[PDB]
Amino acid sequence: SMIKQRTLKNIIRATGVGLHSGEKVYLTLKPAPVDTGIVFCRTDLDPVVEIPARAENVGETTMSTTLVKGDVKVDTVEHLLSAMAGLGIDNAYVELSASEVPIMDGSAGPFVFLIQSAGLQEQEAAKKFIRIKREVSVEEGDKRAVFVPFDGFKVSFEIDFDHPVFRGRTQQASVDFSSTSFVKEVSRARTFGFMRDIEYLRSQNLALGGSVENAIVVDENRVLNEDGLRYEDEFVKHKILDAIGDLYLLGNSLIGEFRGFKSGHALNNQLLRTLIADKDAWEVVTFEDARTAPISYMRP
Ligand SMILES: C[C@@H](O)[C@H](NC(=O)c1ccc(C#Cc2ccc(CN3CCOCC3)cc2)cc1)C(=O)NO
Ligand SMILES: [Ca+2]
Ligand SMILES: [Cl-]
Ligand SMILES: [Zn+2]
Known part of the structure; x- marks a missing residue:
């Protein structure tokens, strides 16, 4: 079989606080279609601001890696993305109720466990x-x-x-x-x-x-x-x-x-x-x- 793109098999929810902002934040990981990539979404805003997790959207790198679009930012994406990379997840929507990803226990462990508890879903397209x-x-x-x-x-x-x-x-x-x-x-x-x-x-x-x-x-x-x-x-x-x-x-x-x-x-x-x-x-x-x-x- 070919190596297939992967997304989430089920919705994942977590609550935490941003390491740097200290803000309480609700994190929701959702399945996404083929060739979506990982896309962050500030759902506290209306309309939402969606920022693909791509190098071209990195706007700040002091202390942590920050994505920027318009006036809006998503702070400290690196530990969540490390878990996504480590598990081979191609496509996912990452909803956040605040500007910073929750720090959890400071590692990628809690994200990896939440994802592997939900399970991954292979998709009918070649992984690139x-x-x-x-x-x-x-x-x-x-x-x-x-x-x-x-x-x-x-x-x-x-x-x-x-x-x-x-x-x-x-x-x-x-x-x-x-x-x-x-x-x-x-x-x-x-x-x-x-x-x-x-x-x-x-x-x-x-x-x-x-x-x-x-x-x-x-x-x-x-x-x-x-x-x-x-x-x-x-x-x-x-x-x-x-x-x-x-x-x-x-x-x-x-x-x-x-x-x-x-x-x-x-x-x-x-x-x-x-x-x-x-x-x-x-x-x-x-x-x-x-x-x-x-x-x-x-x-x-
Ligand atoms: C590794 C880098 O590259 C980068 N980490 C950072 O820059 C970075 C990490 C953590 C922190 C912190 C902290 C902190 C801890 C505890 C307390 C309260 N305590 C009260 C009782 O006594 C002890 C203090 C206050 C503050 C500061 C900076 C990264 O991991 N980037 O991904
Ligand atoms: Ca910064
Ligand atoms: Cl550097
Ligand atoms: Zn780190």
Whole structure:
């Protein structure tokens, strides 16, 4: 059988708060037709504003990835999109009653569980992949983000925090999803912030919804969360989760390899824009036989 596009098999509902705005928000995920892509919808507005989750609609990348259309924004899309990418969802409507996606527990875990509880639905159209044909690299300062050709999907990231909790730890990780499960090894990795910054962030209307229930809080010499970490390398694994979500703004699953060095949402988006512009470096492919494809997906 061909690798088919996927949507949701049932409507999903969740309530939460935006990490940065602190606003209560109702999230509804709905099935969508073939070739829709992932589309965010601000249903608190009338008429609604619908914003496709595509690189061309990224309008801001400070702290989190933000989609913009007209005067309207949808903040912090990366963790939800990481779950969508991790589960291979092509088409979905994402309804929000406020401007920011709920942070949940700070990871993609709750979204992944809500989606897999609803189930996925294959659709009668070939799933389209973007295959990297040539290396594409962007840099700014000491930050770097690269796409290289690779027969599969692989993401590597390196952080370099000048901080006592990070020095001497695993600050580089590589995940090849032919041998590593997105669900078990990436999806549960939570976002993190530094205690030293919280008052300043709040003074800028940032991290207003943050709590130890949705973020790892790193103090000057210790992790504050009394219940501990989920992974010894949870920090760099969360950066990989972020990269997977930002990369899904291409609108299709990737066949290739990503390597990031201190690359945040801004440089991730610049990599996507450079790749899209360099049309010699990529192609759209489909698979008439899932058995011969370089990527495989779980049953729906
Ligand atoms: C990883 C990045 O790349 C990015 N995350 C961020 O920028 C980011 C994340 C989280 C936060 C936060 C927070 C916060 C936590 C708790 C409290 C209240 N507590 C009261 C009791 O004592 C302790 C404090 C207040 C605020 C701030 C910033 C990302 O994940 N992007 O996707
Ligand atoms: Ca921002
Ligand atoms: Cl950046
Ligand atoms: Zn994140």
